[PDB]
Amino acid sequence: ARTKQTA
Amino acid sequence: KGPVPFSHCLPTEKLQRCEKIGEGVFGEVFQTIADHTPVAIKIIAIEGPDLVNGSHQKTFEEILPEIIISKELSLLSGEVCNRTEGFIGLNSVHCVQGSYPPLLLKAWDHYNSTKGSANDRPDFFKDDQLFIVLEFEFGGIDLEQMRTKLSSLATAKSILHQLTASLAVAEASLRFEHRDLHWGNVLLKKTSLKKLHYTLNGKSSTIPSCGLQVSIIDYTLSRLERDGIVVFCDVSMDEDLFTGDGDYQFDIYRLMKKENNNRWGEYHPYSNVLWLHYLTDKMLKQMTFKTKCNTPAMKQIKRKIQEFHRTMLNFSSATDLLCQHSLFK
Ligand SMILES: Nc1ncnc2c1c(I)cn2[C@@H]1O[C@H](CO)[C@@H](O)[C@H]1O
Ligand code: NA
């Protein structure tokens, strides 16, 4: 999980 | 005073036991142990020129709000009128100088090989590089990693109840908004307490634990006030916060902006409601319960939680939900 989307 | 070497925060034995447990744009989180007690160490590079994980490093002034809010929330476990252990303990904060310790780079590497990382390998910092190192209580495992490990629908209700109460107490004490309560930021740890205690405006109540203590972490985007001084992260100009898709999480940022008219200094406890809704949505759609949902009682709990999901957006705060919503009667 992360605040902003990012592979 | 000035900074201290990494060795100050992480003497040999503590450093040797560090294992990476999480990450964000901010940097890295390691678990280790001191005085026989697990801890989590959050390490944030500051004041340097290198892009880190796609963003510029914060200044010491820009990192202060997180520190202040971490302290206030940690303090709630010790207060009287408004008391909860549902955040996370803050042990210490240090300003550290050095290049990244080789043992932490090895731990970094191990995580990247097993879990995969969205961060840059932190091996480009020079010897004069500064960091802030925040040492927290170890709060267990995040809800995303526990999504196939919850026992039953009762466990789901307890987690939602704990979250709601913790937020309500922070609302009442500090006009707190988390503003970033995605499921990486809800931690679960086993407890042998059958019930957990909180105090809201002088009234003490309990919640059945179902064997778990919940901790809310990561106050990077959070907001509160003390002495009518507001402490917050002004994300009004941060467009990419608002353009995510593919998870309801990313609608929550858009919906917060709508609620607050892009004015992040104001208090809008409805954001806490929006995050609770997102978490309730996760409980209903992304969890595989170990005991599935196989009895009339468990099905009933699932129905009550769906009812909560359909109604809870018509409440104005976590405090309103806790005090008035039928789920918590
Ligand atoms: N105090 C803690 N106890 C246990 N785990 C922690 C923390 C903290 I601070 C962070 N984390 C883990 O690191 C991830 C990134 O913040 C979070 O998603 C989480 O997996
Ligand atoms: Na806690």
Side-chain angles (χ1 to χ4, degrees), chain B residues 167-168 170-172 174-177 179 223-225 230 259-260 263-270 272 317 319:
Chain B
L167 291 167
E171 282 178 357
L174 297 156
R175 293 157 57 91
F176 178 74
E177 299 173 50
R179 303 182 169 176
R223 176 255 190 235
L224 56 60
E225 56 196 283
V230 187
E259 165 66 20
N260 65 28
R263 287 206 192 88
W264 296 88
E266 295 172 354
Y267 181 44
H268 290 273
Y270 188 67
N272 288 333
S317 63
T319 302

mmCIF file of all heavy atoms in Angstrom, chain B residues 167-168 170-172 174-177 179 223-225 230 259-260 263-270 272 317 319:
data_model
loop_
_atom_site.group_PDB
_atom_site.id
_atom_site.type_symbol
_atom_site.label_atom_id
_atom_site.label_comp_id
_atom_site.label_asym_id
_atom_site.label_seq_id
_atom_site.Cartn_x
_atom_site.Cartn_y
_atom_site.Cartn_z
ATOM 1 N N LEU B 167 -10.174 7.388 16.410
ATOM 2 C CA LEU B 167 -10.360 8.630 15.694
ATOM 3 C C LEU B 167 -11.217 9.594 16.461
ATOM 4 O O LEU B 167 -10.894 10.817 16.516
ATOM 5 C CB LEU B 167 -10.869 8.379 14.255
ATOM 6 C CG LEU B 167 -9.845 7.721 13.325
ATOM 7 C CD1 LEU B 167 -10.481 7.205 12.028
ATOM 8 C CD2 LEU B 167 -8.679 8.636 13.030
ATOM 9 N N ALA B 168 -12.294 9.098 17.070
ATOM 10 C CA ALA B 168 -13.168 9.964 17.848
ATOM 11 C C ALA B 168 -12.436 10.638 18.994
ATOM 12 O O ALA B 168 -12.624 11.829 19.273
ATOM 13 C CB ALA B 168 -14.353 9.175 18.380
ATOM 14 N N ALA B 170 -9.239 11.261 19.203
ATOM 15 C CA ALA B 170 -8.315 12.252 18.622
ATOM 16 C C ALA B 170 -9.027 13.538 18.092
ATOM 17 O O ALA B 170 -8.548 14.690 18.272
ATOM 18 C CB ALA B 170 -7.511 11.589 17.528
ATOM 19 N N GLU B 171 -10.218 13.334 17.516
ATOM 20 C CA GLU B 171 -11.108 14.420 17.169
ATOM 21 C C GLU B 171 -11.385 15.254 18.386
ATOM 22 O O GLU B 171 -11.258 16.478 18.354
ATOM 23 C CB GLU B 171 -12.417 13.883 16.642
ATOM 24 C CG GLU B 171 -12.318 13.424 15.246
ATOM 25 C CD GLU B 171 -13.613 12.825 14.717
ATOM 26 O OE1 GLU B 171 -14.617 12.704 15.464
ATOM 27 O OE2 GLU B 171 -13.590 12.468 13.525
ATOM 28 N N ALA B 172 -11.786 14.589 19.469
ATOM 29 C CA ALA B 172 -12.260 15.304 20.629
ATOM 30 C C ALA B 172 -11.120 16.038 21.321
ATOM 31 O O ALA B 172 -11.305 17.120 21.828
ATOM 32 C CB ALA B 172 -12.938 14.342 21.599
ATOM 33 N N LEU B 174 -7.887 16.790 19.923
ATOM 34 C CA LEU B 174 -6.962 17.506 19.072
ATOM 35 C C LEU B 174 -7.517 18.032 17.747
ATOM 36 O O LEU B 174 -6.740 18.486 16.930
ATOM 37 C CB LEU B 174 -5.769 16.575 18.766
ATOM 38 C CG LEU B 174 -4.930 16.138 19.975
ATOM 39 C CD1 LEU B 174 -4.178 14.829 19.771
ATOM 40 C CD2 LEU B 174 -4.032 17.252 20.441
ATOM 41 N N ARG B 175 -8.820 17.927 17.524
ATOM 42 C CA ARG B 175 -9.399 18.196 16.209
ATOM 43 C C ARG B 175 -8.530 17.550 15.095
ATOM 44 O O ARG B 175 -8.125 18.190 14.098
ATOM 45 C CB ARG B 175 -9.670 19.715 16.051
ATOM 46 C CG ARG B 175 -10.757 20.181 17.004
ATOM 47 C CD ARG B 175 -10.727 21.685 17.328
ATOM 48 N NE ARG B 175 -10.809 22.575 16.153
ATOM 49 C CZ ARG B 175 -11.942 23.066 15.620
ATOM 50 N NH1 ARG B 175 -13.125 22.730 16.097
ATOM 51 N NH2 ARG B 175 -11.881 23.877 14.567
ATOM 52 N N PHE B 176 -8.266 16.249 15.321
ATOM 53 C CA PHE B 176 -7.433 15.426 14.467
ATOM 54 C C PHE B 176 -8.159 14.894 13.248
ATOM 55 O O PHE B 176 -9.307 14.404 13.349
ATOM 56 C CB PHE B 176 -6.895 14.249 15.256
ATOM 57 C CG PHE B 176 -6.041 13.294 14.447
ATOM 58 C CD1 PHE B 176 -4.754 13.636 14.075
ATOM 59 C CD2 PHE B 176 -6.537 12.048 14.088
ATOM 60 C CE1 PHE B 176 -4.000 12.735 13.330
ATOM 61 C CE2 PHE B 176 -5.794 11.130 13.395
ATOM 62 C CZ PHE B 176 -4.522 11.488 12.985
ATOM 63 N N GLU B 177 -7.433 14.921 12.138
ATOM 64 C CA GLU B 177 -7.753 14.202 10.905
ATOM 65 C C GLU B 177 -6.533 13.447 10.474
ATOM 66 O O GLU B 177 -5.439 14.037 10.343
ATOM 67 C CB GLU B 177 -8.143 15.136 9.794
ATOM 68 C CG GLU B 177 -9.373 15.998 10.018
ATOM 69 C CD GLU B 177 -9.566 16.998 8.911
ATOM 70 O OE1 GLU B 177 -9.526 16.618 7.714
ATOM 71 O OE2 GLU B 177 -9.742 18.190 9.215
ATOM 72 N N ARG B 179 -6.179 11.747 7.381
ATOM 73 C CA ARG B 179 -6.076 12.174 5.990
ATOM 74 C C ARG B 179 -5.336 11.220 5.027
ATOM 75 O O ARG B 179 -5.253 11.509 3.837
ATOM 76 C CB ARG B 179 -5.538 13.610 5.874
ATOM 77 C CG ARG B 179 -6.361 14.602 6.610
ATOM 78 C CD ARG B 179 -5.833 16.023 6.442
ATOM 79 N NE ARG B 179 -6.780 17.006 6.944
ATOM 80 C CZ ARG B 179 -6.548 18.325 6.999
ATOM 81 N NH1 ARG B 179 -5.395 18.837 6.582
ATOM 82 N NH2 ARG B 179 -7.471 19.144 7.483
ATOM 83 N N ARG B 223 -3.439 16.269 10.363
ATOM 84 C CA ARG B 223 -3.738 17.576 10.799
ATOM 85 C C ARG B 223 -4.297 17.516 12.215
ATOM 86 O O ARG B 223 -5.155 16.672 12.506
ATOM 87 C CB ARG B 223 -4.796 18.171 9.884
ATOM 88 C CG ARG B 223 -5.314 19.551 10.268
ATOM 89 C CD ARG B 223 -6.714 19.544 10.891
ATOM 90 N NE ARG B 223 -7.182 20.922 10.976
ATOM 91 C CZ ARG B 223 -7.615 21.558 12.066
ATOM 92 N NH1 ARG B 223 -7.788 20.913 13.192
ATOM 93 N NH2 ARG B 223 -7.923 22.860 12.008
ATOM 94 N N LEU B 224 -3.876 18.452 13.069
ATOM 95 C CA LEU B 224 -4.545 18.659 14.317
ATOM 96 C C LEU B 224 -4.314 20.110 14.745
ATOM 97 O O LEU B 224 -3.647 20.895 14.049
ATOM 98 C CB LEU B 224 -4.049 17.628 15.357
ATOM 99 C CG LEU B 224 -2.549 17.545 15.654
ATOM 100 C CD1 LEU B 224 -2.008 18.865 16.184
ATOM 101 C CD2 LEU B 224 -2.307 16.437 16.669
ATOM 102 N N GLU B 225 -4.887 20.502 15.859
ATOM 103 C CA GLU B 225 -4.489 21.780 16.486
ATOM 104 C C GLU B 225 -4.281 21.629 17.988
ATOM 105 O O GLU B 225 -4.855 20.741 18.621
ATOM 106 C CB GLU B 225 -5.489 22.871 16.197
ATOM 107 C CG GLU B 225 -6.881 22.562 16.608
ATOM 108 C CD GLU B 225 -7.858 23.511 15.956
ATOM 109 O OE1 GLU B 225 -7.920 24.665 16.452
ATOM 110 O OE2 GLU B 225 -8.549 23.080 14.960
ATOM 111 N N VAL B 230 -2.606 25.313 14.316
ATOM 112 C CA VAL B 230 -2.915 24.179 13.490
ATOM 113 C C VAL B 230 -1.604 23.637 12.958
ATOM 114 O O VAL B 230 -0.758 24.373 12.526
ATOM 115 C CB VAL B 230 -3.785 24.531 12.278
ATOM 116 C CG1 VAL B 230 -4.226 23.296 11.555
ATOM 117 C CG2 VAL B 230 -4.997 25.353 12.681
ATOM 118 N N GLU B 259 -14.795 18.029 0.247
ATOM 119 C CA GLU B 259 -15.323 18.386 1.565
ATOM 120 C C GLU B 259 -14.702 19.675 2.054
ATOM 121 O O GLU B 259 -15.395 20.514 2.595
ATOM 122 C CB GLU B 259 -15.080 17.254 2.586
ATOM 123 C CG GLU B 259 -15.254 17.626 4.060
ATOM 124 C CD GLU B 259 -16.650 17.999 4.475
ATOM 125 O OE1 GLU B 259 -17.657 17.652 3.791
ATOM 126 O OE2 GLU B 259 -16.744 18.670 5.516
ATOM 127 N N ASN B 260 -13.389 19.838 1.850
ATOM 128 C CA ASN B 260 -12.692 21.003 2.416
ATOM 129 C C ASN B 260 -12.457 22.190 1.475
ATOM 130 O O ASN B 260 -11.842 23.196 1.862
ATOM 131 C CB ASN B 260 -11.404 20.590 3.133
ATOM 132 C CG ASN B 260 -10.362 19.997 2.208
ATOM 133 O OD1 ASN B 260 -10.308 20.308 1.032
ATOM 134 N ND2 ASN B 260 -9.494 19.145 2.773
ATOM 135 N N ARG B 263 -9.001 23.477 1.150
ATOM 136 C CA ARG B 263 -8.435 24.279 2.214
ATOM 137 C C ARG B 263 -8.030 23.367 3.400
ATOM 138 O O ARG B 263 -8.824 23.038 4.239
ATOM 139 C CB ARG B 263 -9.438 25.325 2.658
ATOM 140 C CG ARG B 263 -9.625 26.470 1.681
ATOM 141 C CD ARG B 263 -10.091 27.682 2.459
ATOM 142 N NE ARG B 263 -10.572 28.779 1.629
ATOM 143 C CZ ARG B 263 -11.831 28.911 1.205
ATOM 144 N NH1 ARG B 263 -12.772 27.985 1.503
ATOM 145 N NH2 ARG B 263 -12.159 29.965 0.481
ATOM 146 N N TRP B 264 -6.762 23.001 3.444
ATOM 147 C CA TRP B 264 -6.300 21.886 4.287
ATOM 148 C C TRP B 264 -6.007 22.325 5.710
ATOM 149 O O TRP B 264 -5.857 21.520 6.581
ATOM 150 C CB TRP B 264 -5.091 21.246 3.609
ATOM 151 C CG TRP B 264 -5.546 20.667 2.325
ATOM 152 C CD1 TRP B 264 -5.628 21.297 1.111
ATOM 153 C CD2 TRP B 264 -6.128 19.379 2.152
ATOM 154 N NE1 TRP B 264 -6.164 20.441 0.176
ATOM 155 C CE2 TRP B 264 -6.482 19.260 0.784
ATOM 156 C CE3 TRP B 264 -6.301 18.276 2.994
ATOM 157 C CZ2 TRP B 264 -7.053 18.088 0.258
ATOM 158 C CZ3 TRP B 264 -6.861 17.121 2.478
ATOM 159 C CH2 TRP B 264 -7.237 17.037 1.119
ATOM 160 N N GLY B 265 -5.936 23.619 5.934
ATOM 161 C CA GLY B 265 -5.777 24.136 7.287
ATOM 162 C C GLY B 265 -7.050 24.011 8.121
ATOM 163 O O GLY B 265 -6.974 23.911 9.344
ATOM 164 N N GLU B 266 -8.221 24.001 7.486
ATOM 165 C CA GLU B 266 -9.468 23.909 8.245
ATOM 166 C C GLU B 266 -9.662 22.509 8.863
ATOM 167 O O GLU B 266 -9.057 21.552 8.398
ATOM 168 C CB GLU B 266 -10.665 24.213 7.330
ATOM 169 C CG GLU B 266 -10.687 25.643 6.809
ATOM 170 C CD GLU B 266 -11.770 25.871 5.758
ATOM 171 O OE1 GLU B 266 -12.447 24.903 5.321
ATOM 172 O OE2 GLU B 266 -11.916 27.026 5.342
ATOM 173 N N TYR B 267 -10.546 22.404 9.856
ATOM 174 C CA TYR B 267 -10.946 21.113 10.457
ATOM 175 C C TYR B 267 -12.186 20.573 9.782
ATOM 176 O O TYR B 267 -13.271 21.202 9.849
ATOM 177 C CB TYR B 267 -11.267 21.319 11.921
ATOM 178 C CG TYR B 267 -11.664 20.101 12.707
ATOM 179 C CD1 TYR B 267 -10.975 18.893 12.579
ATOM 180 C CD2 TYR B 267 -12.708 20.155 13.626
ATOM 181 C CE1 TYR B 267 -11.342 17.789 13.322
ATOM 182 C CE2 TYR B 267 -13.064 19.047 14.378
ATOM 183 C CZ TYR B 267 -12.353 17.872 14.225
ATOM 184 O OH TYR B 267 -12.672 16.798 14.980
ATOM 185 N N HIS B 268 -12.032 19.456 9.113
ATOM 186 C CA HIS B 268 -13.176 18.728 8.539
ATOM 187 C C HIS B 268 -13.138 17.250 8.946
ATOM 188 O O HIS B 268 -12.604 16.439 8.204
ATOM 189 C CB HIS B 268 -13.158 18.851 7.016
ATOM 190 C CG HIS B 268 -13.480 20.222 6.526
ATOM 191 N ND1 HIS B 268 -14.774 20.640 6.310
ATOM 192 C CD2 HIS B 268 -12.687 21.277 6.218
ATOM 193 C CE1 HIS B 268 -14.768 21.908 5.923
ATOM 194 N NE2 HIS B 268 -13.513 22.307 5.840
ATOM 195 N N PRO B 269 -13.709 16.912 10.130
ATOM 196 C CA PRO B 269 -13.695 15.510 10.668
ATOM 197 C C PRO B 269 -14.427 14.507 9.795
ATOM 198 O O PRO B 269 -14.253 13.295 9.935
ATOM 199 C CB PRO B 269 -14.338 15.662 12.029
ATOM 200 C CG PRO B 269 -15.111 16.929 11.962
ATOM 201 C CD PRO B 269 -14.322 17.833 11.082
ATOM 202 N N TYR B 270 -15.168 15.024 8.817
ATOM 203 C CA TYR B 270 -15.797 14.173 7.857
ATOM 204 C C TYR B 270 -14.754 13.368 7.114
ATOM 205 O O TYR B 270 -15.064 12.262 6.675
ATOM 206 C CB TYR B 270 -16.649 14.978 6.851
ATOM 207 C CG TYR B 270 -17.472 14.081 5.938
ATOM 208 C CD1 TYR B 270 -18.512 13.316 6.450
ATOM 209 C CD2 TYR B 270 -17.240 14.024 4.564
ATOM 210 C CE1 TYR B 270 -19.282 12.509 5.640
ATOM 211 C CE2 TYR B 270 -18.040 13.221 3.720
ATOM 212 C CZ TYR B 270 -19.057 12.463 4.269
ATOM 213 O OH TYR B 270 -19.861 11.630 3.487
ATOM 214 N N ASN B 272 -12.301 11.773 8.344
ATOM 215 C CA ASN B 272 -12.157 10.565 9.140
ATOM 216 C C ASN B 272 -13.271 9.586 8.814
ATOM 217 O O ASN B 272 -13.057 8.383 8.767
ATOM 218 C CB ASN B 272 -12.203 10.890 10.612
ATOM 219 C CG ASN B 272 -10.942 11.597 11.095
ATOM 220 O OD1 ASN B 272 -9.876 11.425 10.531
ATOM 221 N ND2 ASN B 272 -11.082 12.420 12.105
ATOM 222 N N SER B 317 -18.644 12.920 11.699
ATOM 223 C CA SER B 317 -17.343 12.679 12.263
ATOM 224 C C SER B 317 -17.256 11.249 12.785
ATOM 225 O O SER B 317 -18.275 10.562 12.898
ATOM 226 C CB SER B 317 -17.044 13.651 13.392
ATOM 227 O OG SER B 317 -17.937 13.491 14.430
ATOM 228 N N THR B 319 -16.564 10.722 15.895
ATOM 229 C CA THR B 319 -17.245 10.898 17.155
ATOM 230 C C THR B 319 -18.793 10.681 16.973
ATOM 231 O O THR B 319 -19.422 10.001 17.741
ATOM 232 C CB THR B 319 -16.967 12.323 17.702
ATOM 233 O OG1 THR B 319 -15.556 12.542 17.852
ATOM 234 C CG2 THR B 319 -17.631 12.542 19.083
#
